[PDB]
Homo-oligomer: 114 residues x 2
């Protein structure tokens, strides 16, 4: 099966600062001969299920703030929160949707540094 | 780990007819003190990642039409589409978010029998 690994498992930065989360896939997620990757990023708030943020590595779902951006292609991806806000504190997961069903990485808890 | 089983794997009903999907969890997902089930339902269109439809077994996400409804508790749940429309043709997954990360059932392909 495909292995999805995120780094770090938890991180904290000051309000307004940039936060970066890494995700590695054991399998190259490029789709066929296209430039698109079957890699998505989700946000999970306490007691809630994960909700879609980004698909195809960098495309934002309608309604998602511009401070959320994804990069990478192949096996290594990155989710960046350019300026961390209070409402962004949550667990972020990368997800490969090449397989049926898709599978998530371990998730990365993002917090505000006191 | 937790085993999420859906039944059937594929189904088709006439336009406007009711579609029913079953999901079984090897893990009791009900927190009796809060009366909440860490069970959600997602919809996946071709080439896209799964998007949230229902959380806490029966609560619909904002924007989801009322023809979609979830029921069940503990280990057995059901997603029901009262009147199947063409835009509903997709793969549906139940998801347990008891563990970290959450995991999906095998998925159920829903089509219109014209
Ligand atoms: Ca019929
Ligand atoms: Ca109770
Ligand atoms: Cl979603």
């Amino acid at each position: 099966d495909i292995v999805m690994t995120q780094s770090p498992d938890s991180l904290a930065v000051s309000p307004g600062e940039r936060a970066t989360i890494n995700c590695k896939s054991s399998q190259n997620l490029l789709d066929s001969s296209f430039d698109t990757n079957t890699l998505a990023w989700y946000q999970q708030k306490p007691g809630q299920p994960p909700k879609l943020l980004i698909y195809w590595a960098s495309s934002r779902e309608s309604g998602v703030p511009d401070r959320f951006s994804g990069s990478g292609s192949g096996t290594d991806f990155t989710l960046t929160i350019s300026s961390l806000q209070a409402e962004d504190v949550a667990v972020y997961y990368c997800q490969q949707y090449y397989s049926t069903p898709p599978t998530f990485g371990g998730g990365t808890k993002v917090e505000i540094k006191r």
